[PDB]
Amino acid sequence: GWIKGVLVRCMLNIWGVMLFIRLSWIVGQAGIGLSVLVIMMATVVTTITGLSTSAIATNGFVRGGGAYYLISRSLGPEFGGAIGLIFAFANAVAVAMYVVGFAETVVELLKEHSILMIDEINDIRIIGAITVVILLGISVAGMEWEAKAQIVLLVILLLAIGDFVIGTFIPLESKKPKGFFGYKSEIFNENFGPDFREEETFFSVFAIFFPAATGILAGANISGDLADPQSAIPKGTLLAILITTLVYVGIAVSVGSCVVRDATGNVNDTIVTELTNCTSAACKLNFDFSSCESSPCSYGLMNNFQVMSMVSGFTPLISAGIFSATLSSALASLVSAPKIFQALCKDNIYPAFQMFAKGYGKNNEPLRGYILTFLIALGFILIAELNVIAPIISNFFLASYALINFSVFHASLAKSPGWRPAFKYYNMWISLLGAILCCIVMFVINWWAALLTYVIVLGLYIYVTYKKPDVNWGSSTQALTYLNALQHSIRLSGVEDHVKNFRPQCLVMTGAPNSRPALLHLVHDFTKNVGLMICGHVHMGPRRQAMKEMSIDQAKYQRWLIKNKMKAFYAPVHADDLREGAQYLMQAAGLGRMKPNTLVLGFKKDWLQADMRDVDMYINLFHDAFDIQYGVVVIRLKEGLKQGKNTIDVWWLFDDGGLTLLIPYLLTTKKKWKDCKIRVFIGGKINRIDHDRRAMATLLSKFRIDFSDIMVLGDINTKPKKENIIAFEEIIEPYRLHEDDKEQDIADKMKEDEPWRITDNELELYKTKTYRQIRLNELLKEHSSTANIIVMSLPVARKGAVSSALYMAWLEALSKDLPPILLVRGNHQSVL
Amino acid sequence: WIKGVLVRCMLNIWGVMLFIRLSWIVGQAGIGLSVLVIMMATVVTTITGLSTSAIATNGFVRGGGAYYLISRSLGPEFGGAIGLIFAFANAVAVAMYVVGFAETVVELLKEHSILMIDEINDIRIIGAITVVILLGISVAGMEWEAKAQIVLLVILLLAIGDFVIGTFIPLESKKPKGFFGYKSEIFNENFGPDFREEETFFSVFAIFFPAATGILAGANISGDLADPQSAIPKGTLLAILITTLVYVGIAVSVGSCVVRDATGNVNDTIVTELTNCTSAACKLNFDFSSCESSPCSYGLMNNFQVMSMVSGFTPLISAGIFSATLSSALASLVSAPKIFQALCKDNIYPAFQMFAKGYGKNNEPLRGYILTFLIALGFILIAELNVIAPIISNFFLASYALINFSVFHASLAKSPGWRPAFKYYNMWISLLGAILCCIVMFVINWWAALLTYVIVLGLYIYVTYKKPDVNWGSSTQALTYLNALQHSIRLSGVEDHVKNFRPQCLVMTGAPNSRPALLHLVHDFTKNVGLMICGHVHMGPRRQAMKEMSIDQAKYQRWLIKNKMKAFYAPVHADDLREGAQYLMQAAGLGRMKPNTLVLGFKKDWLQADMRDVDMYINLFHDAFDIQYGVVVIRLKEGLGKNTIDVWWLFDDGGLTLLIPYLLTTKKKWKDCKIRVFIGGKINRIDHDRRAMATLLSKFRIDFSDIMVLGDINTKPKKENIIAFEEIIEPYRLHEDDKEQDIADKMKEDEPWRITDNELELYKTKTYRQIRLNELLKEHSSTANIIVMSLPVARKGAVSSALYMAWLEALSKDLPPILLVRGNHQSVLTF
Ligand SMILES: NS(=O)(=O)c1cc(C(=O)O)c(NCc2ccco2)cc1Cl
Ligand SMILES: NS(=O)(=O)c1cc(C(=O)O)c(NCc2ccco2)cc1Cl
């Protein structure tokens, strides 16, 4: 593997302009020990983030290529996106940092040669604009060029830092005008001072140093391909942070022991005999610093930001090295950030940003993404001063690192993916501690900008929480949502008591979900968010071709159920007939306590023109649903289409456990039937109108129906009319067995060859039930004609007590021409 | 309803800070700043009131505990978080009110002549004694809790009436101090902001926020209302409206009545003299000099009896302070232990369970009492007032911020039980309120805010998965049930194609109490990578089936959740085992969580059992294969080199034979694996087949120890094993050649399962292969933790069930735990 390549790229990202152009003021403002402290703290947080991103790279997404899929699925759909935004924005503003550094170095280069000084902020702005022009011109195309240029340039950078540690080794009297002393002992003692002359504090110089150590995420996940991408990249990058920390400590100590804080650029201010009062760094010598305690100093350590780069020997090589380092870091940042934006746009967790992904050229680079990154980077370039801008970039890098640490901690704690340890010091608690320390430290720097950072993080969490995108868990890593669903189902199965909640769970026995859409919508009304709907389908046919047909039907009808705004589980079964497959579904479907407890059938509207064997299976389906204590709900809709305008009439005619009252109430809460007034109809005696009405009203207050009105009807149990019974017997006539007219042997033959014939004996035996059904239909047409939905208790009979033709004729006569009617019968156990 | 809970809420909110500190606050801060402080505290309290109003209007009829309301509406995690924070806030607020009462008592002693010691220590001793007497009243005060509160409210309104009457009554003795009734001349000097001795705008707000607290404690905590859905919103919100405006009124009247600098001395009664005095002190003649140059002792700044100086009949006003403070303390000491015991009974904190127990007429926690009134005395030791007040303010702000953020989070993420339907509620209002609470939480104190942030974050981390690991703790099914709904829908909506294959097992063992080791072995390779459904076919009468199935389901699910098994007990009712297994294979599971493999224990004692049962058990194999399922036949011994998991790969069945050992290895008990993969290949360059199988293994991430290629299969075994097999199958063998044709025909049609001599002659090579494989397993794999071999398979009706089970018994005769695995041709590197 190219541990060499990863090392050189991570180094070149760290070894930028903040590496060696500001450390002079870092040690001049603070001292030796305090600079060592800030370097060590930046090292601690950087190595915690390095261990975190090492845990990202080596395991959990070892096979997975690319940064963003790994950071998303190996962590969580929520956690990856925020990291992407903040770290991309941090790179975008780092571009501004490094071009400002190049610009101020160019200003210093021009100042000595130029006879006059143009506006300094304007000079920095125009030079930075030109540098970003070169940056984009390089970043249009080419990656092997940077892959070689990094190895080309790291040697020159090491030569530059060697020139720093060697320029003091050669002293010179011409170097004495500037306050230069060669590795003297007094300088280190002078510079080991904990609080110093500049008003800025410790956390200020912490911000001034911190972005230099940032950028380690580039080689771990942002880096892609480059031969071996795993199992040795973490060790190489960790070694990179370690060696950068060692060289930072070395150069800080060397510069602190090198040069005194304030200096006078003159041959004067040298005292022949003054051993007392220690005016300069060299107390007995006092070569340079005198009379500049209150006067501004031209070439001071803290007063001049770049004195170490000017007083180092062979300084043109230093000047070239500054350009090389800052341009290399700028190229790295500006090839990173736009592709980060484009990657998050392509994954489209946030469709509001999705159009930024362009892929204009042969490479997938975003042209409009390049323009947007150019604009925002130049916007931060508009601030031509580096001292206050550097904390801003520090804030977003350190915040992104804190989010990475907390994401790694949450991934280790939850371990929804594989997420092996596969690392030394893989501990999640140390990552949590690093994240907390990062949060506090980010706060201490620029409390207002920090508060805006928490605001942005909370807003990102707010957006990603309510909106669940089928991006990474949805594509190629469905194991995450599978395990979440499995864990939630196991948790649900752990509840001890089920008697508290009836929880209406429906098994809709409609074969084709695309067919009968209004009935599926009506079922979805009462089970949308209160219960489980399972749209069963019994596929009969050859068993050899059964499995492929069932699979393709599952795919197609599940796509249909998801496309329409429904929450249904398509469950297909293979059986010889309807009854066997329905038995399969009713006794076996569901997981744990997500098992259907009501059976929902559509009214068989073609029972007149269908074979009576199918009607027998329909009625026996009613009966063996009642055997398993299911609740039968029969829906008869005009399929040529529901609108809620006035009322939803409920006809409480039987105590079925309260299902026929529970379903209408669940209809009201869906905001489609919000403007619908429940008007319960009950059957009581004329003398008992007040008692029944009052008790029923209290019973609804127990169901919390909040009835509009309750009307008691004495019209039931009367002879319906001459016409309606005529129509009923005309409906019966094709299936009626006229045993009176036929001979007894002929009647027995016609009964045995077709046992579904309705006879004259049980027609007169069940006369009162038939008259009750017809009378109820008359009352429905009179009182419930203007109603959105009608709910009544469906009639039942003992198994074999009635012919199937008679039972379906009762169901047809009861619901003849009404609006959508919902005949409900429930198991006798209470639903409260 | 209104007056039942308004009295309690007004007693709670009108506390110690109404009387002694309001004058001081409107002295340090101007009247404009006092109005700003009271108004913005009112904004915070009203936002919390709308949040808790939505919480109460969430659709459950009556919840006893307000914490339990938070729990059933938002969830166990947030419910526990607000419960703990609010309980601690009430516990420390009890100490605050005790310190306030002790302050009034000690400064009344200073009003009198008797003073035992320095007033600072007198605060400590009086606070301790008052904690003792409040314990004496606290244990059982049912008549004091209900009957005395209306009297206390009457006394409090009486006291505020005397305050107004005192504002409207000038007197000569009030003239040396600051007292000028409702005049602009001192309103001019008093309007200005005059902060003194390190005081800031947020510090006076930090001590003022204790006054506007406990809006939940007054009415919502008790949970005894005629209309809990509707009276709770009107009980609190209107109370705030009848509270804070009264506050504002005082903030005006004091600012209009008493001067910012008042000399207690009677010496500086200036004669009517022509002196300018641009300061408002001499606008009316009395100078109030030398109290601003030197330390002062009166005038909204250096005294707190200035409000008592305003009001006549000062015993009545002092009784007003006493009644208000003790009523607030009594409300807090009732609120906190009840919520704390509800936390323990909800089992969110297992270590806290010892606090739950209590005895009495109504069960109350004595452990909670002793801990709260111990930490109260711990805060009594800090006698300094404006240091106690900020930490109670911070903790109440923590409770309110957590409430608002949790309500907003439940509204945002579309939580399952979220239909509040409150008259005027907005989720954005709650979010803004939580943000404002966090900001003003920080600004008043940084270390306290940091400690609160770190403790609530640690609590959130603890309740993430450590508590939902086994027992999440919610006794309400809904927050679980509907939740799984979306997740199963979250599983159903994804287009998995055939890319995602997971081991989804349908174990067929009727009694999970029997064969626990087999269930553990199945759980080993399906713990976190698939679905495991233990299925039971209940045989018996149909009439008593449902109750028997319900009892068995409850018992076996409790057993499966007690032992660390993640399984679903799925019972089906059928006449025979084959029909129930067909039910479970066809229909069990929902969405993408449907069984993919069939797990069958090896039918030991099949020699003793009737051959019809063996025939049905064998027909289970052929039914599973038809529905395209995978069959594993574990012959784990039920009595319970080095550690090794041997894999004999003799057939290409979709890689399940290799997938099962890999899933075994990624477990704690099988961490040491040393997988040895044996394969049968014809005699050739062995290394070719070895490296091809090695590449196929490296696809599976198996980390093999060695692939051994053995060609000793397909040879005649030893004669001992063959005759042993012959004696095994002898009782079930129809010797058609030995006997006559018609006896054989009678025995065949009577017993179709009899194995003929023709089946033995046809399948001689297969039988020899099975018994030779058994010899090879004994020779090569005698010492191993697990053996996994491809399952023998025959076409339907080709072999008798006796011969088939004799093959399965001969193959696995005296071996370690052996799994005979056959899979559908699906899992070709798809996992
Ligand atoms: N309401 S119905 O009688 O016309 C009806 C109709 C159907 C239906 O076929 O849609 C159905 N599904 C079972 C099935 C058979 C073939 C495919 O699915 C069930 C019923 Cl009850
Ligand atoms: N693996 S087995 O053949 O010995 C077996 C064994 C059992 C078993 O009895 O545990 C079982 N349960 C079904 C049942 C019927 C009546 C009671 O349970 C099913 C099977 Cl396949």
Swiss-Prot record, chain A:
The keyword Disulfide bond applies. Its main location: membrane. Residues 476-493 are annotated as: Scissor helix. Changing S204C: Slighly reduced cation-chloride cotransporter activity. Changing L386C: Active at elevated intracellular chloride concentrations that are inhibitory to wild-type. Impairs transporter activity. Impairs transporter activity and reduced sensitivity to NKCC inhibitor bumetanide. The chain holds residues 286 to 1208 of 1212 of the full protein. It is found in: Basolateral cell membrane. Residues 111-120, 170-201, 257-313 are extracellular. Changing S328 to C/A/D/T: Abolished cation-chloride cotransporter activity. GO terms for biological process: ammonium transmembrane transport; cell volume homeostasis; cellular response to chemokine; cellular response to potassium ion; chloride ion homeostasis; chloride transmembrane transport; gamma-aminobutyric acid signaling pathway; hyperosmotic response. Changing F210C: Reduced cation-chloride cotransporter activity. Changing D655A: Impairs transporter activity. Residues 52-82, 145-147, 220-234, 339-366, 407-429, 461-832 are cytoplasmic. It is linked to Deafness, autosomal dominant, 78: A form of non-syndromic deafness characterized by congenital, profound bilateral sensorineural hearing loss affecting all frequencies. Some patients may have mild motor delay early in life due to vestibular dysfunction. Sensorineural hearing loss results from damage to the neural receptors of the inner ear, the nerve pathways to the brain, or the area of the brain that receives sound information. Keywords: Acetylation, Cell membrane, Chloride, Deafness, Disease variant, Disulfide bond, Glycoprotein, Intellectual disability, Ion transport, Membrane, Non-syndromic deafness, Phosphoprotein, Potassium, Potassium transport, Sodium, Sodium transport, Symport, Transmembrane, Transmembrane helix, Transport. Changing R798A: Impairs transporter activity. The RFXV motifs mediate binding with OXSR1/OSR1 and STK39/SPAK. Chloride 1 binds at G16, V17, M18, P211, A212. Changing T201C: Strongly reduced cation-chloride cotransporter activity. It is a multi-pass membrane protein. This is Solute carrier family 12 member 2. Na(+) binds at L12, W15, A325, S328, S329. K(+) binds at N13, I14, Y98, P211, A212, T214. It comes from Homo sapiens (Human). Disulfide bonds join C278-C283, C292-C297. Homodimer; adopts a domain-swap conformation at the scissor helices connecting the transmembrane domain and C-terminal domain.
